[PDB]
Symmetry: D2
Subunit: 247 residues, 4 copies
């Protein structure tokens, strides 16, 4: 009765988490747990219906070719998807029109909603800024998520005057990093995990959208949601947002 779910990259950090979550879920049956060395025929041997793939950019295309050829739906968190790679995936899917592939940069439902909300709000305010706050072991400033969020905001603000700012005197860096005309401030503080606030303002009011992750495994519910719903959309879907079915 339960949906048969395989996990590729099962010994990686994300994969191993997803293995546990699939096992715990009552309505999902773990049908495979593969890492480098394991033949993909194990997926078809055990009647896997959908896989979760967080492998490495160097192997994901090989995985996807097999999956699609065998009508096995794929929930993909692996990065490194160039325009040429997306195009290849699309062509493979022409031959297998009932197969579904989802490729998403972010699976945390809260982060996905937060980005969508920021996109909807952006054109209705004079000012927009992003503040992100993370643990002080993080290599990159600003985060991937903050940079992608600021780009969405910029894109949605097409044609608007830039953010008003009378700054004439400053210490270097005080106004943050400029991502497509949107300031992005990166706080690195012991005691934090992963946090992001998007601020919008016009004379008289402000609107703030804040996402807090308190545990590194907070994406799990979005991956499982993608697994349960992935077959609703035939073909290739990019990003988790369409799956949320926002009216």
């Amino acid at each position: 009765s339960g949906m048969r779910v395989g996990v590729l990259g099962a010994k990686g950090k994300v994969g191993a988490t997803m293995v546990r979550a699939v096992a715990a879920a009552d309505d999902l049956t773990l049908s495979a747990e593969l890492d480098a060395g394991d033949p993909l025929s194990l997926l078809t041997d055990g009647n896997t219906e959908v896989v979760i793939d967080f492998t490495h950019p160097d192997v994901v295309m090989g995985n996807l070719e097999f999956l699609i050829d065998n009508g096995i739906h794929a929930v993909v968190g692996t990065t490194g998807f160039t325009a040429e790679r997306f195009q290849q995936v699309e062509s493979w899917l022409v031959a297998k029109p009932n197969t579904s592939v989802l490729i998403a940069p972010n699976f945390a439902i809260g982060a996905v909603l937060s980005m969508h909300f920021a996109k909807q709000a952006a054109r209705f305010f004079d000012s927009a800024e992003v503040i992100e706050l993370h643990h002080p072991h993080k290599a990159d400033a600003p985060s991937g998520t903050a940079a992608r969020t600021a780009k969405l905001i910029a894109e949605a603000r097409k044609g608007l005057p830039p953010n008003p700012d009378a700054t004439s005197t400053s210490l270097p860096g005080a106004r943050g990093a400029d991502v497509d005309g949107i300031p992005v401030h990166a706080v690195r503080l012991a005691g934090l995990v992963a946090h992001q606030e998007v601020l919008f303002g016009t004379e008289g009011e402000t609107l703030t959208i804040r996402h807090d992750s308190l545990d590194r495994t907070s994406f799990v519910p979005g991956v499982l949601l993608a697994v349960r719903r992935i077959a609703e959309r035939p073909g290739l879907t990019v990003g988790l947002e369409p799956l949320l079915d926002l009216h």
Copy 2:
């Protein structure tokens, strides 16, 4: 040859909202103030001066009379006045059948930020195990919780129908600690000197939380939404309820 602006009248012009809108219409380059009426002024002044659209924040006792005149004369109406029952909305709809070109918009909130917040709360509500509302206002406010907080909590509850209720292990408590229960959604009302009008909607599931916060630092923060409604009101014939459709979300 450049067209003069849209001719805008304001009803209830000596009220606090009206007077603000009078100033904002005068300041706007694309809008011409064609009337500023309060109780005692005949509505024929609107047609005498070729008013195209009115802003109406009057009183529930007069608004239906205003709307009947406006619709009969093909004058669009942006209405912030409350007290709209199902019977009243129906009456407005039937008046409009005879005047298909005319547009009426009735909205309980014109602050763009508050409208977006409620919309966001509605979209997020089904995706999290827990939802709560915290609202914070100046300490001269008569009602706890606010109208906006109560409406927000109701939208949230509605969108969560067929989900399990909020998890809560509370077995021992001081009375009131868990807030007011609005359709299974806790609502907490802070009253603090130095505040104006503030609302936070909180959503959570194990591992993450999402917070939507709206701050109004000035009582006149609705102005940009009323003006938006005025500029765009004619795009939709007939009756529109709420500002949200006009945002084109």
Copy 3:
């Protein structure tokens, strides 16, 4: 060279955490790890200098009598200290004037500072309220910490007019719980751990003091601070605050 630290109640949840932290600290040597059944003579047999005690209210007095008699300093997190118990501890200490005992309800440095700050600010504003937010497995609303904080605030506001409030119409519970004239609001939300905000306001400005704990073991640095500094104050100290040496 390193200070010899024993832990009583070592198989309890707090004790076991403190055992690990003592072992990890370079300047502290774990000299005993006792639970029910173990004779206290093990403390003196192994030259223990200071103990951490998070046992049970039913045993703590017996522990303290022995510790004091043997000149062993005590950092005590166990509750259930009545006025009669504090008095007994004080009398035992008369005979042993160089021994130190610290009894504290809260060891998280951030929570201790937050309570002290709230106390200092309280008399300078027209309004004060407490919002606490916790995971939804918590039995008590409001928390112990929030209730103690609101009491400190009330006490510091002696003689002031009560909080201004024009509320004439309300749903039951909307204005929170009244702790000595101070509203306390208790949020219970999945995804949270332990969080507290104290809000102060007068016309024109507000001041907010917020403490966030993201992990249940965030008290550890305060217990260790108490252990390192406990001998600076002879006799009985109640609360961690005096140890922080706030000028």
Copy 4:
């Protein structure tokens, strides 16, 4: 027989701060406005009307002249004017030796909330691995970061001397992402329409964080601290620097 109030003069009375203080002194029941002077008015008006204390928010170019007169005449001074070098503070001190009963208070910030925040930041700073400042202001502000944020970061750095610096694994970044470095303390400056003046100081160690936030929603939020200084200024003979001693913390 009930004593009339304390006789308070305001210098720079037509300036924005002065005019506000004139109104606040007039409104206060225990204080009598005895003078309201601006440039052009002779200081002898203060002694002619038996002024006991003045509030001075004038300009750095005149304040020393004002203070010399005030101290010579035994008139207490509550001073918000900036530009006080070590040489100026020393000059004030020496004037006061001759007039031991007189009190002068010079303070860079009179908002009680801002004074407490800085004090709290100073007390907390040595107890956490990380410290950062975020300040948020209206987008007409010329300077980034604000004066108050820069001063706060300096206090924090000073209180953290002999601690390891803030931990940070940043190896790759866009320019400016990590804020401005003020004495090893990151300071981030947000400029957003709809804001007034806001500051958050953040402290953290693995497992917990502590945040101190000050919000000013109105430009006149300093008034209660100036009045406090006026009422209490005579309790301390001589020169006091900063409002913090008067709070009795």
